[PDB]
Design a protein around this ligand. Structure first.
Ligand code: K
Ligand code: ZN
Ligand code: ZN
Ligand code: ZN
Ligand code: ZN
Ligand code: ZN
Lengths: 183, 385, 353, 30
């Protein structure tokens, strides 16, 4: 049984979100400023600048692309709370009306990536993967967590949407509430 | 600041004379919210009945306002909301299981019949009244059919669908600079307070009940944002208030506003669910304690509109509105009811009076002093007109 | 026409004997109107023209009720939004709708040899993602559901517990009154708001003495031959200092949404307005938390998450005494210096004249 | 001096211990 030991501050950030999309009824403002792709490209670029071994950087880029594609394919299935699903559907409608097939990675913020990571242990232990492969995955995502916690106040700052602007979250109207929750 | 002053009887002001206008459509009494509903359009008939048996038709001119059309109603609501109202009927409700949940029109305020027609009549009445005032043939317009102040911009909450008070205030604002909206229904008039929260040309002042009671809004600290800071006066009262305490709170706040805001047109929402014995309300007011406030507003002599409102027991509200109209026409009405078609409801005494109960008064004077102190301290800054 | 109405019987029928027994002891002037009303169309806008497996009653993705589509091939049913992509109810799927799992099974034809074959195929194609391969294959085979935090992270905090429908509830919520609605229909008028009965609410239960009001220091109990001098003492839920509903000017009994907090709890947020944010952590309860005693007690600043004693940074009363004196005296010094520079610029501009 | 008297008056008047803790927490936050 594998275990992933997230730093405490990111657990607090996750619980803070878990309240925000629950009984305060806010949602994630989209398209956010720092999507998933910018995060991971910055991570990989910064880590390849210091790493000298070839296989290290090969496994680095493999991890990057793999996390990317799996987020891309799983976001719709199991990363969204109940209240958000309506915004998701509306985004699909807009994309299909504009004839651009939807990519989750170029709209959604990093908080969903933290949601993914927080899930990841169950995702892996529900499978038949190799012990060494799952172990290297845990070590890898752990290094990603470390690099993320070094910059935690660049993405996850608080701004109180009800007063100034451009906070990471926004409020919903009563019609959006009614449709999304009480369809 | 509040100081206990007893109940002085209401009397007609001698000099203030004015040529009023009574709007009544002969059909609105037929509608009826299906089965057991606290507000119903039968009590719009009973009122008129009495005014036609007391013979006030010689004292003022009664019209019927040509109804509002979709474009005119959509000065406030969104196209989709107005349209969905104009389309829905209980046969094809199932076709609308997305909108009927978005717009809240299926649960507390059901769809019954003539819905669009009823709402259109109330809206057209309100607008034509503001217009005749605006143009100036009269100096008052009573519209006892309108007054749906909970209906928000894109959802009908609280048994009321079309928010005609907002349309009336807009048509008023077409000519008059500043308009003052005085609400004395027991609930909080969140529709109008919201729809003029970010402006300085309309000042809303609502005396409502606070606590776990519909609609849970209307604290004392909601005092308007944007350019409209300090231009909204919510007064949260407590249960069981009597006529004396209500008058002693009402009079100074309204005098202070009209000293400092200086409105050019008043819109008074004369609801009847603040009366003793209602299914919904929890106050303990009489007929005199409720006519006193309208008498006070009239005293100043500003072009004004009186609008209807709640009403959960047709006997109290019918007699109250007959009395209020009589008072507006500088006539104190005889306390014995003549013979009319609905003579049977008014038992057992068959009189024009409403009786208070012995419910326990809770509004402690120190509470009132603190509230009126906060409100005066805020209003200190509306001195510039 | 024989169909019963609100009255109990058909409309064309007088009262029965049972009702009249248990309910007994033993020209007009609005004829007019079509003569006085004359239409008004004086308004400004008159120019405007104007195998039988039984399905579920739950969204097995979110385990709450609603209007849901059911499956033709498994008993599992979802709300119309809980799908990927979510399906519009206006344009329903023409014909039978098959869930992800049954569509998966019929796509694999109940043959695991093809399963392992296509798994080898998939891992052959994208060697670029050779690591995540199993999951990338399996994602399309699991039925959707909302995202629940893994319990191993709900446990890090003790004061974070889920509500009824999987919602955040941080113990600042009072409680599920439930049976109190039966209590709300009390046989004797003694309803929740506590009107006309405050004899034994002014007196502590266990101790037996009086509940004093921190702001006026009188349990005003009146006299229940003369009740117009009660003042509705209520007690907080955290600190329990009993307050008057007239000192904290609010006028209601906070009884349904949350627990009431006195004006004696310091912040839980900042809004610096010149506009920075929080000064308080969460409850990083259990053994895991590390308490740290400072080695320096006069100018250590470190946080606003202090803990007072005779990473949470402990401190003593005299230390904060010193630090507040430091704030006060530095503030008076800088205020004096601001007045000094003000007056000295004044004197410079005067002597220039 | 007289400020020691200030804080002792506070300790006595505010009375309970927890409430004095809250007072000091406010003072430290400032
Ligand atoms: K305003
Ligand atoms: Zn009402
Ligand atoms: Zn669902
Ligand atoms: Zn199925
Ligand atoms: Zn007190
Ligand atoms: Zn407290």
């Amino acid at each position: 049984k594998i275990s992933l030991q997230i730093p405490i501050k990111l657990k607090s950030v996750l619980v803070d979100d878990w309240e925000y999309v629950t009984k305060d009824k806010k949602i994630c403002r989209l398209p956010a400023d720092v999507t998933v792709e910018m995060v991971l490209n910055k991570y990989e670029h910064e880590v390849s600048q210091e790493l000298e071994s070839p296989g290290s950087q090969s496994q680095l880029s493999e991890y990057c692309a793999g996390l990317k594609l799996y987020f891309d394919k799983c976001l719709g299935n199991m990363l969204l709370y109940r209240l958000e699903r309506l915004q998701y559907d509306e985004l699909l409608k807009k994309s299909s009306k504009d004839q651009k097939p939807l990519v989750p990675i170029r709209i959604y913020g990093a908080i969903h990536l933290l949601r993914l990571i927080s899930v990841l242990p169950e995702l892996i232990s529900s499978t038949t993967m190799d012990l060494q492969s799952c172990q290297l995955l845990i070590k890898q995502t752990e290094d990603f967590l470390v690099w993320l916690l070094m910059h935690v106040d660049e993405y996850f700052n608080d701004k109180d949407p009800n007063r100034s602007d451009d906070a990471l979250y926004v409020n919903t109207s009563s019609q959006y509430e009614g449709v999304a929750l009480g369809m | 600041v509040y100081e206990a002053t007893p109940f002085d009887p209401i009397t007609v002001k001698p000099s203030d004379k004015r040529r009023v206008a009574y709007f009544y459509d002969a059909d609105v009494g037929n509608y009826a919210y299906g089965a057991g509903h606290p507000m119903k359009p039968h009590r719009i008939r009973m009122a008129h009945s009495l005014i036609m048996n007391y013979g006030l038709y010689k004292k003022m001119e009664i019209y019927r306002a040509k109804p509002a059309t979709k474009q005119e109603m959509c000065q406030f609501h969104t196209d989709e909301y107005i349209d969905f109202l104009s389309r829905v009927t209980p046969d094809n409700l199932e076709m609308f299981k997305r909108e009927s949940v978005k717009f809240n029109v299926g649960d507390d305020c059901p769809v019954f019949d003539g819905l669009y027609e009823y709402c259109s009549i109330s809206g057209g009445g309100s607008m034509e009244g503001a217009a005749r005032l605006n143009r100036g043939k009269c100096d008052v317009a009573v519209n006892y059919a309108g007054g749906l102040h909970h209906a928000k911009k894109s959802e009908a909450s609280g048994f009321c669908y079309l928010n005609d008070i907002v349309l009336g205030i807009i048509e008023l604002l077409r000519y008059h600079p500043r308009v003052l909206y005085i609400d004395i229904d027991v609930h909080h008039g969140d529709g109008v307070e919201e729809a003029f929260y970010t402006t300085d040309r309309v000042m809303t002042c609502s005396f409502h009940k606070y606590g776990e009671f519909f609609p849970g809004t209307g604290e004392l600290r909601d005092i308007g944002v944007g350019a409209g800071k300090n231009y909204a006066v919510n007064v949260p009262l407590r249960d069981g208030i009597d006529d004396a305490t209500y008058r002693s709170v009402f009079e100074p706040v309204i005098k202070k506003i009209m000293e400092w805001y200086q409105p050019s047109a008043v819109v008074l929402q004369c609801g009847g669910d603040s009366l003793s014995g209602d299914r919904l309300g929890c106050f303990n007011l009489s007929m005199e304690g409720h006519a006193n406030c309208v008498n006070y507003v009239k005293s100043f002599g500003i072009p004004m509109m009186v609008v209807g409102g709640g009403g959960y027991t047709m006997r109290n509200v019918a007699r109250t509105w007959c009395f209020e109209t009589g008072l507006l026409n500088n006539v104190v009405l005889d306390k014995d009811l003549p013979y009319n078609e609905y003579y049977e409801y008014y038992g057992p005494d068959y009189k024009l009076s409403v009786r208070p109960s012995n419910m326990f008064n809770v509004n402690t004077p120190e509470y009132l002093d603190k509230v009126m102190t906060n409100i005066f301290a805020n209003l200190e800054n509306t001195k510039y007109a | 026409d024989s169909k019963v109405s609100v009255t109990g019987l058909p409309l064309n029928k007088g009262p029965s004997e049972k009702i009249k027994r248990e309910s007994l002891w033993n020209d007009l002037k609005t004829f007019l109107t079509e003569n006085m009303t004359e239409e008004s169309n004086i308004r400004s806008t008159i120019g405007w023209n104007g195998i039988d497996f039984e399905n579920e009653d739950f969204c097995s993705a979110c385990n709450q009720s609603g209007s849901f589509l059911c499956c033709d091939t498994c008993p599992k049913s979802f709300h119309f939004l809980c799908l990927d992509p979510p399906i519009d109810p206006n344009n329903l799927p023409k014909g039978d709708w098959h869930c992800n799992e049954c569509k998966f099974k019929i796509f694999i034809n109940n043959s695991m040899a093809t399963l392992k074959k296509i798994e080898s195929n998939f891992i052959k194609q994208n060697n670029n993602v050779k690591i995540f391969a199993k999951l990338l294959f399996n994602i399309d085979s699991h039925n959707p559901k909302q995202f629940q935090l893994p319990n191993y992270i709900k446990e890090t905090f003790p004061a974070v517990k889920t509500g009824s429908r999987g919602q955040y509830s941080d113990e600042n919520d009072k409680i599920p009154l439930t049976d109190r609605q039966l209590f709300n229909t009390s046989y004797g008028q003694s309803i929740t708001k506590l009107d006309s009965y405050n004899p034994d609410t002014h007196i502590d239960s266990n101790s037996g003495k009086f509940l004093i009001c921190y702001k006026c220091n009188q349990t005003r109990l009146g006299s229940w031959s003369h009740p117009e001098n009660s003042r509705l003492i209520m007690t907080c839920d955290y600190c329990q200092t009993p307050w008057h509903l007239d000192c904290v000017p609010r006028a209601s009994f906070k009884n349904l949404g949350s627990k009431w907090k006195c004006p004696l709890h310091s912040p839980t947020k900042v809004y610096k307005k010149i506009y920075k944010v929080w000064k308080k952590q969460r409850l990083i309860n259990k053994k895991n938390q590390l308490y740290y005693e400072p080695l320096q007690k006069i100018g250590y600043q470190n946080n606003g998450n202090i803990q007072i004693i005779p990473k949470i940074t402990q401190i003593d009363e005299n230390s904060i005494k010193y630090d507040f004196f430091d704030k006060i005296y530095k503030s008076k010094m800088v205020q004096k210096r601001k007045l000094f520079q003000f007056q000295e610029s004044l004197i410079d501009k005067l002597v220039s004249n | 001096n007289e400020e020691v008297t200030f804080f002792e008056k506070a300790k006595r008047y505010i009375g309970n211990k927890h409430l004095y803790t809250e007072f000091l927490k406010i003072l430290n936050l400032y």
